[PDB]
User: Fold Magnetosome protein MamM from Magnetospirillum gryphiswaldense.
Amino acid sequence: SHMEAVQNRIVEAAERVPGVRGVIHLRARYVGQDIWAAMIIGVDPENTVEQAHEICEAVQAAVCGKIRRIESLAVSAEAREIGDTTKPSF
Amino acid sequence: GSHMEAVQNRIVEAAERVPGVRGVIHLRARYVGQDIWAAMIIGVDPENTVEQAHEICEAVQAAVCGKIRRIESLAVSAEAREIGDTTKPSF
Assistant:
């Protein structure tokens, strides 16, 4: 819950990137005042593997751009169906 | 860790038989208790769909977990790999 606000900022940043259907999972830790994090995003299942990689790169740039305290971020992509409203796991 | 090395090679060989696997990019394996927990990244055609790539991952899981009894957990994820790429698996 001391992680809560920052996790929500990261999710919100990622979810405003074109091609992102939602964030599936986010592992984030503080190390001092820097953040290290790994995120799984959901994308159209009919995107190609190369398309999905591009969206992952876009999320990395956007999230790091908005949340400057992030020192390291990994992003990976999995299939998500268009009406899935399942909340992110943390 | 010659014994774990041996196990790793057996996982790679089982994975690389699976249709759609261009090669294993990465494998991390370790004992958690007396079982093995492992995570592997496989290389696949970049033109696969995400859902296609997932099925290949599930095919690999079934194949590996069927040959190596001691693996309790195996996570498999897919990344783009070009067809003539030669880089061997990393550990």
